Amino acid sequence: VNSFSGYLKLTDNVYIKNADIVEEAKKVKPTVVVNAANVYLKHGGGVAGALNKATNNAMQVESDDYIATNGPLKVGGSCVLSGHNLAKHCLHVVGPNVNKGEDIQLLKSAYENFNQHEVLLAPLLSAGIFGADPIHSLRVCVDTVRTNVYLAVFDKNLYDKLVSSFL
Ligand SMILES: NC(=O)c1cnccn1
């Protein structure tokens, strides 16, 4: 049993809810929250901007030190950093950004990072300002992630479309 509440069960391991991932993280304090990161860990907008704002910019300070030491992530890659006030850990995962012309086939590689964690609170990778079709992102998630993932969808309209179109 875990603390996640109000989720619709899509599969054996994938759950979904219409929710603000910041508000959900603040309530649950999950072991892992996933950030929709870019390779530079520049948390300017979308899930990343909202998560970083909720940490009072501590996520960005930590991230800048990580990049200064290690250099940029790969598209499809990830790193584990602090979850600050939101979670124990933040898994920063880089999905392809369609608005930068990145290979959508890298979305499966991105979701494979989730398999290193038994339970996660996450957004749909490459959705929102990353430009991918969120229906596609949910299908790749279900077909790739084997660990238990609780998906928070910010938009109510999109949530209802994801549920009502789910195969
Ligand atoms: N939870 C949010 O504030 C958020 C903002 N932008 C995109 C997705 N989620």
Encoded amino acid at 105, one letter? Q
| Technique used | X-ray
Cα–Cα distance, 8 to 51 (Å, whole number): 23
Q: Resolution, rounded to a tenth of an Å?
A: 1.0
Tokens of 34: 């996933």
Cα–Cα distance, 44 to 111 (Å, whole number): 22
Q: How many A from CA of 101 to the centre of ligand 1?
A: 22
- Give residues (CB < 6 A) around ligand 1: 20-22, 46-47, 50, 128, 154
User: Closest Cα to atom 5, ligand 1: which residue?
Assistant: 46
C-beta atoms surrounding 45 within 10 Å: 13
Question: Which of 18, 20, 52, 153 has most ligand 1 atoms within 8 Å of its beta carbon, as the pocket-test mutant?
Answer: 20
Residue 96 gets which letter from DSSP? -
The H or E element containing residue 17 is strand 14-18
Q: How many A from CA of 162 to the centre of ligand 1?
A: 17
Tokens of 51: 């998560």
